[PDB]
Amino acid sequence: MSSARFDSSDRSAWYMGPVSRQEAQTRLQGQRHGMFLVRDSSTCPGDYVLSVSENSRVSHYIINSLPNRRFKIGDQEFDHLPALLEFYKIHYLDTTTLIEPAPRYPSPPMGSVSAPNLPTAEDNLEYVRTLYDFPGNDAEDLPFKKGEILVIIEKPEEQWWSARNKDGRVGMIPVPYVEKLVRSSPHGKHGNRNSNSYGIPEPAHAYAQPQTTTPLPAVSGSPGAAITPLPSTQNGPVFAKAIQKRVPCAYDKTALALEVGDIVKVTRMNINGQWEGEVNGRKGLFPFTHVKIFDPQNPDENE
């Protein structure tokens, strides 16, 4: 499969250090698809710009240095640079994901003279506002309202674009639901203008960076002890391994056989304490006293 078998670690693959808008735009214009580069940015020593070329555009995703724990590339936080490059392998930073890095120039990356991927077509897309409202509420469906400003950060399809919300969230949005600022034309009488609408006149270059826009954290506290069974957000199924074994006893009344050390993928939990999980091919009700909830993301051993 691969799709992306560039080594996500070694500087001599992807890191080109001193590049900046100046160089990055010319080396990622015209002849690239899936080609990217991470560079030392000039905003402030500590921020980086992962510029990826797809749809004949250069999407600039900024990697932000957090307080020594991990990095934050557009709100989404990953423990390190090699970690975020894996998420975008299945995310698609456009109609394509991270595939292979761009040529060499300043700091030593992979270093190719030319790329076999000759692209096709181009587009504009930048500032698009939502008129219809669509509360999909996910990273797959960007929840927008009757008057949100989005930035067309990724474009996989033509009916659905991946735009970033005011909160910087990148999700797919329907084109018939939105209107481009680069499209000033008579639709339903644009004579009333309202192009200014509401906002302060600050023409900044916001990059393609998913603009988190921190609304002042009222509750920002370090996780103490983490003795709470669920100290993480609902991302998907819950992972609990059966500490003890359960054979097909209990007189076969929805008894899910759970072996010692076996991982129970529980997707449905009843608040009584009876949970129904999918193990191998059987779904049964197991008690919380039979399993132990653990952190699915263990930084120890394997990471």
Specify whether 105 is located in the same domain as 6. Answer: yes
DSSP result, 92-111: -SSSS---S----SSS--S-
d(CA 187, CA 202): 27
CA distance 222 to 159: 42
CA distance 118 to 43: 32
The answer as to whether 212 is a domain residue is: no
- Do residues 244 and 301 share a domain? yes
Phi and psi dihedrals of 176, rounded to 5? -60, -10
**Which single residue is written with the structure tokens 């997707």?**
267
- Give yes or no: residues 104 and 22 share one domain: yes
Q: Which long-range contacts (CB under 8 A, 24 or more apart) does 77-82 make?
A: 79/299, 79/303, 81/8, 81/38, 81/48, 82/8, 82/9
Asked if residue 230 is part of any domain, the answer here is no
Task: Indicate whether 94 belongs to any domain.
Answer: yes
Q: Per the structure, how many domains does the chain have?
A: 3
End-to-end CA distance of the chain: 22
Of 91, 114, 137, the residue at which a domain comes to its end is 114
| Same domain for 104 and 13 | yes
Cα 200 from Cα 229, distance rounded (Å): 44
Residues 6, 110 within the same domain: yes
| Domain ranges, residue 257 | 235-303
17 and 101 share one domain: yes
Same-domain pairing of 106 and 138: no
The reply to whether 14 falls in a domain is: yes
300 and 276 housed in the same domain: yes
Determined by which method?
NMR
SS3 category, 190: helix
Residue 67, judged by CB atoms within 10 A of its CB (0-12, 13-18, 19+), counts as: exposed
Q: Is 154 exposed, middle or buried (0-12, 13-18, 19+ CB in 10 A)?
A: buried
Which CATH number does the domain housing residue 47 bear?
3.30.505.10
42 and 18 together in one domain: yes
Please report the sign of the dihedral spanned by the C-alpha atoms of residue 183, residue 30, residue 58, residue 97.
positive
Asked whether residue 245 is assigned to any structural domain, the reply reads: yes
156 and 123 co-located in one domain: yes
Q: From residue 46, how far is each of 71, 107, 167 by CA, in Å? A: 10, 16, 22
Report if residue 69 sits inside a domain.
yes
Residue 208 within a domain: no
DSSP3 helix / strand / coil % (the chain, rounded to 5): 10, 30, 60
Tell me which residue of 50, 152, 154 sits closest to 96, measured CA to CA.
Answer: 154
From 181, 202, 219, give the residue that closes a domain: 181
Domain edge (last residue) among 160, 181, 202: 181
Residues 173, 108 share a domain: no
Q: What's the angle, vertex CA 193, arms to CA 122 and CA 213, rounded to 5?
A: 65
Nearest to 274, CA basis, from 297, 298, 250: 250
Q: Are residues 75 and 102 in the same domain?
A: yes
CA distance 231 to 15: 35
* Neighbour count for residue 84 (Cβ, 10 Å): 25
Q: What is the CATH number of the domain that holds 239?
A: 2.30.30.40
DSSP H stretches of helix in the chain: 11-14, 20-27, 81-91
Asked if residue 100 is part of any domain, the answer here is yes
Compute the distance between CA of residue 251 and CA of residue 249 in angstroms, rounded to an integer. Answer: 5
Q: How far, in Å, CA of 84 to CA of 77, rounded? A: 8
